[PDB]
Amino acid sequence: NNSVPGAPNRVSFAKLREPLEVPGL
Amino acid sequence: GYDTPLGITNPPIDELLDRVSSKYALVIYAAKRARQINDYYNQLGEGILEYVGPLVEPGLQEKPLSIALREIHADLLEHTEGE
Amino acid sequence: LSGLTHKRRLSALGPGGLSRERAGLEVRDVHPSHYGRMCPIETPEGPNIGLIGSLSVYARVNPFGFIETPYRKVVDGVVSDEIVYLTADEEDRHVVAQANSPIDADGRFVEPRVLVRRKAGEVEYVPSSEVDYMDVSPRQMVSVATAMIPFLEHDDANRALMGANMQRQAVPLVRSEAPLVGTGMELRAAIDAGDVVVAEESGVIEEVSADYITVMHDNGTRRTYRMRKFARSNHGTCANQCPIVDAGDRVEAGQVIADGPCTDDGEMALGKNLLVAIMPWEGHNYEDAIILSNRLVEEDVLTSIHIEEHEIDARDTKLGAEEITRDIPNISDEVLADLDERGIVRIGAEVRDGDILVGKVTPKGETELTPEERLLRAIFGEKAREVRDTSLKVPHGESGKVIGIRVFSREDEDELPAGVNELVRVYVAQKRKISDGDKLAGRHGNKGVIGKILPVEDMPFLADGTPVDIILNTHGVPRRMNIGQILETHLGWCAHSGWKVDAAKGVPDWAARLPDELLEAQPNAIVSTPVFDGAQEAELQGLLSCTLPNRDGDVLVDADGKAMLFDGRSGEPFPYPVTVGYMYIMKLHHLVDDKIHARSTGPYSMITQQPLGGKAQFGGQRFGEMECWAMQAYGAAYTLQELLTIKSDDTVGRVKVYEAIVKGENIPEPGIPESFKVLLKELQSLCLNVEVLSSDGAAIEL
Amino acid sequence: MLISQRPTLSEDVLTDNRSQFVIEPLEPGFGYTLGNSLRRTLLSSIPGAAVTSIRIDGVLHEFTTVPGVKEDVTEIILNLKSLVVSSEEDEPVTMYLRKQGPGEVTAGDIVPPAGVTVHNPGMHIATLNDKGKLEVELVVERGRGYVPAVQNRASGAEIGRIPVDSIYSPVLKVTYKVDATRVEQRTDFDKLILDVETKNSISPRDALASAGKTLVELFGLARELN
Amino acid sequence: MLISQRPTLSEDVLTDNRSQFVIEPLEPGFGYTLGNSLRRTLLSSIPGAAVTSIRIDGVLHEFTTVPGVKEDVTEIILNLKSLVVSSEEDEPVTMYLRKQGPGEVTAGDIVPPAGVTVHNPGMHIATLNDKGKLEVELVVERGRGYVPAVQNRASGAEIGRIPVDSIYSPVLKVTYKVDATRVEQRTDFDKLILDVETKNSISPRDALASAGKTLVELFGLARELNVEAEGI
Amino acid sequence: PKLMALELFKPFVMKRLVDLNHAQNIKSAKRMVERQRPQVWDVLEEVIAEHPVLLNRAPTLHRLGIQAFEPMLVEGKAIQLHPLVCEAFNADFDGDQMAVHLPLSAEAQAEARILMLSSNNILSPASGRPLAMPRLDMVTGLYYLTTEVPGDTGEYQPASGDHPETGVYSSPAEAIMAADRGVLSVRAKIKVRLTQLRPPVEIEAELFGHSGWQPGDAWMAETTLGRVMFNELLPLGYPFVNKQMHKKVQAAIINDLAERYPMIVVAQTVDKLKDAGFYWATRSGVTVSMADVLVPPRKKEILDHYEERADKVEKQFQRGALNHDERNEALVEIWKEATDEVGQALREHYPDDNPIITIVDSGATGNFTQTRTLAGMKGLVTNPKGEFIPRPVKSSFREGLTVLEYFINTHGARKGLADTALRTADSGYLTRRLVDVSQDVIVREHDCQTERGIVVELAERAPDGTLIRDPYIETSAYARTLGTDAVDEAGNVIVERGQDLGDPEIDALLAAGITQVKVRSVLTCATSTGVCATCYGRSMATGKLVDIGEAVGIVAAQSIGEPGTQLTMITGGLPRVQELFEARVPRGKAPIADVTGRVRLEDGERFYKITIVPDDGGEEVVYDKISKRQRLRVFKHEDGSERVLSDGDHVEVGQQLMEGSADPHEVLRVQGPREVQIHLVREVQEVYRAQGVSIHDKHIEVIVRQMLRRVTIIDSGSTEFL
Amino acid sequence: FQETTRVLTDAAINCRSDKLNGLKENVIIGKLIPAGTGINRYRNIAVQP
Ligand SMILES: [Mg+2]
Ligand SMILES: [Zn+2]
Helix, strand or coil: CCCCCCCCCCEECCCCCCCCCCCCC | CCCCCCCCCCCCHHHHHHHCCCHHHHHHHHHHHHHHHHHHHHCCCCCCCCCCCCCCCCCCCCCHHHHHHHHHHCCCCEEEECC | CHHHHHHCEEECECCCCECCCCCCCCCCCCCHHHCCCECCCCCCCCCCCCCEEEECCCCEECCCCCEEEEEEEECCCEEEEEEEEECHHHHHHCCECCCCCCCCCCCECCCCEECCECCCCCECCEECCCCCEECCCHHHHCCCCHHHCCCHHHCCHHHHHHHHHHCCCECCECCCCCCCECCCHHHHHHHHCCCCCECCCCEEEEEECCCEEEEEECCCCEEEEECCCCEECCCCEEECCEECCCCCCEECCCCECEECCCECCCCECCEEEEEEEECCCCCCCCCCEEEEEHHHHHCCCCCEEEECCEEEEEEEECCEECEECCCCCCCCCCHHHCECCCCEECCCCCECCCCEEECEEECCCCCCCCHHHHHHHHHHCCCCCCCEECCEECCCCCCEEEEEEEEEEHHHCCCCCCCEEEEEEEEEEEEECCCCCCEEECCCCCCCEEEEEECCCCCCECCCCCECCEEECCCHHHHHCCCHHHHHHHHHHHHHHCEECCCCCCCCHHHCCCCHHHCECCCCCCEECCCCCCCCHHHHHHHHCCECCCCCCCCCCCCCCEECCECCCCCCECCCCEEEEEEEEEEECCCHHHHCCCCCCCCECCCCCCECCCCCCCCCCCCCCHHHHHHHHCCCCHHHHHHHHHCCCCHHHHHHHHHHHCCCCCCCCCCCCHHHHHHHHHHHHCCCCCCCECCCCCECCC | CCCCCCCEEEEEECCCCEEEEEEEEECCCCHHHHHHHHHHHHCCCCCEEEEEEEEECCCCCCCCCCCCECCCHHHHHHHHHCCCEEECCCCCEEEEEEEECCEEEEHHHCECCCCEEECCCCCEEEEECCCCEEEEEEEEEEECEEECHHHHCCCCCCCCCEECCEEECCEEEEEEEEEECCCCCCCCCEEEEEEEEECCCCCHHHHHHHHHHHHHHHHHHHHHHC | CCCCCCCEEEEECCCCCCCEEEEEEECCCHHHHHHHHHHHHHHHHCEEEEEEEECCCCCCCCCCCCCCECCCHHHHHHHHHCCCEECCCCCCEEEEEEEECCEEEEHHHCECCCCCEECCCCCEEEEECCCCEEEEEEEEEEEEEEECCCCCCCCCCCCCCEECCEEECCEEEEEEEEEEECCCCCCCEEEEEEEEEECCCCCHHHHHHHHHHHHHHHHHHHHCCCCCCCCC | CHHHHHHHCHHHHHHHHHHCCCCCCHHHHHHHHHHCCCHHHHHHHHHCCCCCEEEECCCCCCHHHEEEECCCCCCCCCCCCCCCCHHHHCCCCCCCCCEEECCCCHHHHHHHHHCCEHHHCCECCCCCCECCCCCCCHHHHHHHHHCCCCCCCCCCCCCECCECCCCEECCHHHHHHHHHHCCCCCCCEEEEEECCCCCCHHHHHHHCCCCCCCCCCCEECCEEHHHHHHHCCCCCCCCCCCCCCCHHHHHHHHHHHHHHCCHHHHHHHHHHHHHHHHHHHHHHCCCCCCCCCCCCCCHHHHHHHHHHHHHHHHHHHHCCCCCHHHHHHHHHHHHHHHHHHHHHHHHHHCCCCCHHHHHHHCCCCCCHHHHHHHHCCCCCCECCCCCECCCCCCCCCCCCCCHHHHHHHHHHHHHHHHHHHHHHHHHHHHHHHHHHHCCCCECCCCCCCCCCCEEEECCCCCCCCCCCCCCCHHHHCCCCEECCCCECCCCCECCCCCCECCHHHHHHHHHHCCCEEEECCHHHCCCCCCCCHHHHCECCCCCCECCCCCECHHHHHHHHHHHHCCCCCCCCCHHHHHHHHHCCCCCCCCCECCCCEEECCECCCCEEEEEEEECCCCCCEEEEEECCCCECCCCCCCCCCCCCCCCCCEECCCCECECCCCCHHHHHHHHCHHHHHHHHHHHHHHHHHHHCCCCCCHHHHHHHHHHCCCCCCCCCCCCCCC | CCCHHHHHHHHHHHCCCCCCCCHHHHHHHCCCCCCCCCCHHHHCEEEEC
16 A cells, blocks of 8 residues: 555555545655 | 772872861861972972972872872871861 | 654744743643544653644644544444544534444444544543444554654653654664664655655656656656755765666556665665664673674665765955965965865865864954064075965864765855855765764663674674574563564564465465465565554464474474574573564764764853863863862862862863873962952942951951 | 593585684594694685785875766775685785776786786676776785785885775684583593685685694794793 | 784692683684583593492492491492592493491502502491491493483393482593783783683692694694684 | 773873983973874883772762872773762763873872771761672672572582482582582582681680681681682681671671771772672673563463453443542552552562562562563553553563553653653752851861760660661661760669760660660751761761861762652652751641640531540630641551550641651740651651651761751840841 | 842841851862861871871
């Protein structure tokens, strides 16, 4: 679910799905 | 009964205090003699030998204060306490 | 990260606001309304605690100025995808759920009673229907800096605060490496920090070079990105931008093209991965000290680059105009062998402490030479050369190459401050390797100083001959209650060695909730544990028992996570197994080079005549009052008479003692401090007749 | 009950770079100390050769870039730091690297003089575009241990010189294990299995022999003690 | 290669038995590499001789005390274990100690067969009351290092054989340290301080010489593997 | 660091360089020192042979904050520090910085070499207990070394038929050799024969008949090789110690050595102990891992039971019977009980080998509450308003807190971090004022030959037991001079008048049965200016009678102000001490028995009204006390705190009736100076000891003497004073 | 310590004179403190072999 095209692939221990992506920091 | 002290802890403090009434007197009893030895070294080149130099033979470049402490520990000096 | 956090700061002091003294201590505490708006962990450790925070990750500022937070509203017990932003009052008047509360795939609350947050600091179970609003993610109450501390849920609040603050002091190394274990905030923080160049439009790269990159857009227009290299930052560190793309590659829009400082392949990387063994080792790591293998020093693992900056100007004077010239009055040619014709150091010339950096001559008035000085001028044919020497010289404790020189001249129609003609600034770059005194710290708020750097042959080594790169004491982990570091170490070892969960008989019970893609990993893989939602203890326990064997066909760490090390000096194995694993270690900016300070005798102040001087020539320490009570309690009286009169304030006693030490004679008796003569001369000016007297009552002269 | 047989060393080969040495029988509780002594002397006192300084045309210092290359001078210096070379000459010799045109520059493109060789021609040093070229002159010396790059700081050479850290060590990893034969009988002994891996500059046998000679020479002072 | 400064050893004497050996200067990191190996070699390399087992005809086992002696059988075993024996015959020879009447028995009263000798005749072994006697058949064997008695538990079948932990070593205690030295600006050279205390069967100097002999002989195996040069 | 020594010793080094002829004059020497030629380092090493320097760690907080160490050149750029003195400096090697000064004159050099040397400051001045002792990491090493474990390898066994006993060794050398071989664990039950370690008095008086042990005499010991190795570190002649070396045991050993041996021997043995402990800590096998922090086995059931009880209380509240206050009180009590139960269960589950338990039990550092939080249950957490939140956190830091629990927990951390600065500021202000009042007090005389002396109870004799040592004899009468000879029941004198008290004299007095002893004190001194040495008594750091001219007021102020940092919270924290010394009206202001008599109290539900009928005769003094407080124990023969204020009883004059703190002015007025001094000393000591710190009474008597040294005048008569 | 202006005014009004026998005053003026080694009992010591 990497929003940016060329992110490195790092699996995560995520048990929940975030419905909203982090806004512009 | 202990290993031979090394550094600025020789001679042992307890033996020094055995001679002087208290450490506050010992500090002066040592510093005045250190000043005397320094003055003698300063006037070694030429002058009146009024200030007798070190009593115990010093080491290879031993500081005047160390010589004063060693000669105090050797029981070669006597001091009078004011008031 | 430091810049991003600074832009994201929430100051509570300054003009128009409270002052430290006037403000009470009740405003520095947390409030139940800070959930989702202001991070309750991140905060300065100094006196400005509670008056400076940071926006939460999802917090947004409404037009009126009130901080809003996201929520997804539940209509009839079913979670709705659409979200709404609620301010403090609206949140108070409604009911807010908890993200961690279990929810069925259809949006039905499995638990009839769910933990809820109410008006003000009230949390109580409520039926699964009365609940009105639900959070978005468990990481809604943490700032950006605190969102990238793996296993934050296990550390204590103060330890997490310290770790978050220290994450903003990391020094960008020469070769950044992405963390093995880290949350998902790394990439987004790096991208939004603005220190990584990102392609604006999708295209194909024509040619890529270290200096610049050219990308051909799909519409036939070419664009060139210029990457700044070795540019001094705002705090002395260096900023570099190395491209990470190859010629003939089609880059999608928004993809990172080059990585700035502290970035490896477009994700924040503040430090390197080091093999950690947690145990006391001969007392060199006693009480928060750290022991490092010499492999780090000799492999440039923790090598940092710092760029200093010096500048001098030639300002016109009523007596003449200052000019920078290679010729300098009465100096040997060997010293001036590095300067060029223009009078500046040549680029790439190593410069040491006290060396001349740019030569300038200032006009002189009239000052009769001293007898012997004038005679020496006459004998050698050296004219008076009235012009003095004010050439800028490298301050004390600086060294390195001269990477760049910038000169602004009024002749070339350049904007200079009024009264100046020639301004030149020289950049000196120094490469610093980790040594004793430099500070290191992990992400869990456990600082340390390099107590010793042992040779690679002395460090304890695993059963296969892999020496450990760092040793951390075990007496500081449980007392400080930051157990998260051990879990990070275990997960890091699992990620580095790679694991293969057995599945021939089926997924084990402990692996039921693991993602299907997380049952198999390759050696040196990358893993992430999002804050407040990540690998539980059972997951780590299962993973540690399924790590792949080494190339030699043996498994080093046991199920418990400990390994049997070999002593480097004695050569015999340690009686009991020791914990081992890769832990992410940063390098703080509190380097020992800047802290070292010494002063035997330098310049002095003017009004007070006390020791003083810019940090170029270093200033004396501060012998306050408590340091005086400590001296008095000892019964020490001559030391206190000295430290305040003969080496602090006496105008003539200072010169006399310096001469006496530089001569064979004894140290003279101290006089009256100038700080008392000044006090009397000022108290008299208030029309108060202050006069010291003897027993006889006779006035005394001072 | 003196042990009649003295220790013997036999070499086993598991790979071109890795070898196992079995040393036994040894007196009980003695294998660990001997193995650790050999390991300690192997990782710090094996002479070798490594690059000491470089000189890139058109470059004044290491904090800059040369046109046409994909990475700055620091990156190429770091890449060269891993280079492995063995020098027979006991004097500082110079080596040349001239590459031009589009493509990739590797350690095999270097032209070492007589008495020097490069054992990893497949290494990657940098990448070049058709716009720029690369000409590097680098010195190779012989020594042991690890000499900080500052060694050439005081040499007072020309500005072109770029001192580089030197690592004179061919040995890579050393490991030992002891298989004690503790038995009720007095015939109790322990067998040592020394694992050594080298950087391909020298074979493991040469490194072990050098370490043994070093230790023998060092312990000869106890011999002359008598 | 060459060694910057040649290490040298200076012997210091603290007692007729003790000694303090200082090797200085050494290249950084060589302190432990030298000291630990030298200590282990000294402790468990020098050959020696000591009593291996004893007999007591007057007692059927060891639970009780031998009649006519104040000391317990364990005390007798302990006193006889410390006895110093120098032997030159490979095979295990037997020795006999017999005394009658009141008095005290010393190690000097034991008749030694050919070859074996006792270096402390004045050592005290036990005491005898009026009309007291004790006959002991102790065997002496040469060896090296330290070997417990439990590993010597299985030894034929006899009536009152009592294996005893034998000390096949003329050196019984060794200690070492390391201190920094200032030979140059490096100020990191090591200064090994080896402290060795031996029995009367060998002087510390000779013990160190024999340890060096053994260790050099051992490392010769590694050295001969190939021809390659180094420094002093 | 040489870069600092060179720039700090510049005049000395440049002079010596000139004298060695390396330079022709001062100017060339200065230029060369600035350039740092290779010829400077040798002279620099030569010129700091015995030149002590002062190391100071800001903020210096007590007398021992400034030491005098001998310099030594070292590479790098960090000031190396000894591990043991970090306790005195309160310094953690995690980025802390300490300034270094340098005495120049010969007087200053001797002054910093005799008085301020670090070797002479083993004992802290606040109390006669060691401060530079094995503290944090070496303590664990020594504890592991001297520990005894059963059923180890090579443990002593008895004779079994044909097999003799195994585990008897001729000398510690043989035991060490066997341990090196690998057939004897270092900590196992052994019977060695020792020859250079004096046997314990119990064995010495028996085996040798008290003839006196000398080196070369062999005796049979039953102990572990670790204990023998440890005792080799203690100075020769010290009796054999055969106990596990908990921190308290080490403190006792160090104190005894300092009380019976010269300070040089104490420094040597402390250094040797530190080295041995550091070496043996690495091999203690103390680490941290998930397998080492074990969750309690039956925590879920306890949590469920207490949650059910809390839900029952919540339902009871939902009925409306109880309001918010009762609900909060019930929930807080229930969860406190639950936390205690969980802690007990966790303590039972853990074995004695876990590194967590080994660290905590050995006294090295930390307490069991932190372990419970880390592995058991964190428990209810504080709120910014200060009241416990009824909702506890049911997950420890091992399992992992949830979002709500973590957010709630953050309050306590923020509050504590904020409170630290205010507490240190208040402590500094109090220290400043205490130094302010007691600037004058200095020992000016050797003995005032006074007779007045405060009587201090040595140990109350139990009605059933022969004697019970007072819990705080270590602080009340342990170093005070004996004002009057304590004559026994017969004419024999246990201790002569004027002989300083101590451990042996206190033991002898306790054996003789004497309980009340009158000890000379600074508070009754007759010297016009300052306080004689005899009255002040034995010093603490020195260990001997205080020498003339030694400032005691500054030392007392420093000692009282030092524990302010750790003195944590009618508030009973630092503000209690501040108000007690300020002589302000206490907030509680408990009523006092103005005149001894029978009490005739009438209980008013709104305002308590207390009246006492004097026994001798007179009127009833009326007290109008508010009824919102709770009664304190009435002074009765039973003296059981659970007792209530029963009307019609008889009370002693000046005794308090309610809970709180009596006003110092009122107690002084009604009873006199003696009892008000006793009250102030006792109350300040109580508030200090509640936290656990200990400071000798004389350090507070010095302040109280200056406090109560004025006589108000009501009528002038023939006196000029208004 | 506190109220510097008030105490200065009061001292001027009363023309009060103070003895320099305190540690603080001696520290301010630069004289030896009357404590430890500063008391005349120890300062005036004649030492000769
Ligand atoms: Mg600190
Ligand atoms: Zn008195």
